[PDB]
């Protein structure tokens, strides 16, 4: 339950739902090279 | 000088050797011809009687790579590759033979010498 509740609260901690997609993780400003290390690289670096 | 042995023979050789189904560039379907696995007589026979379904590998489409009912005596059921493509590659069964194809004009002559009338009259 520690890990499960930690996953769910890290999902919901931004005041709204966070589906594990580029379509969310690009919207959170959690590091341009985190975004680059995600599946899209050139667009997120190029926007940063 | 009009005919080109290069443009016929070299193109055929390149296409057959590569296995890409184009002329020089085409994309094109690969894997049409492979290298025979000269390791065992059974291996050679399997690679010779191997059958390929060109349905999309590395996909979640279960049905075309599922095992169908229409395989009694056409393909042995318990012979599949194990890796990323399970079920798209088959090996030919014993009694199974492929129709060579024939012209239907003598058959139509048989119909018309017999009594089966065409649709226009």
């Amino acid at each position: 339950y520690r890990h499960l509740a930690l996953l769910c609260d890290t999902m919901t901690c931004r005041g709204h739902l966070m589906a594990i997609t580029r379509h969310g993780v690009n919207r959170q400003d959690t590091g341009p090279l985190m975004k680059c290390s995600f599946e899209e690289t050139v667009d997120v670096l190029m926007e940063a | 000088l009009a005919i080109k042995t290069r443009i016929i023979s070299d193109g055929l050789k390149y296409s057959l050797a590569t296995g890409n189904w184009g002329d020089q560039k085409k994309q094109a379907r690969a894997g049409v011809s492979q290298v025979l696995n000269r390791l065992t007589f059974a291996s050679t026979l399997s690679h010779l009687r191997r059958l390929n379904s060109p349905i999309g590998r590395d996909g979640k489409l279960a049905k075309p790579r599922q095992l169908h009912n229409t395989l009694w005596g056409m393909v042995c059921p318990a012979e599949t590759p194990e890796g990323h493509a399970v079920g798209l590659v088959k090996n030919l069964a014993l009694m199974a033979y492929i129709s060579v194809g024939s012209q239907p004009s003598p058959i139509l002559e048989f119909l018309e010498e017999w009594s089966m009338e065409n649709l226009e009259e």
Binding site: L17, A19, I20, T21 | -
Partner: protein, 48 residues
């Protein structure tokens, strides 16, 4: 999931269920709802 004789609301738990829980889809494959009543309405099969 080995299914059942009844429909059982098509629970379809497993890999795709955990998939859509990881990335919440606006149209899940089986959006199911469990409904509880108050009292004698649920106690009676006819009122149910």
């Amino acid at each position: 999931f080995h299914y059942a004789g009844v429909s059982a609301k098509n629970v379809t738990l497993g890999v795709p269920r955990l998939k859509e829980l990881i990335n919440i889809s606006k149209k899940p494959k089986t959006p199911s709802l469990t409904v509880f009543l108050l009292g004698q309405s649920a106690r009676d099969a006819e009122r149910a």
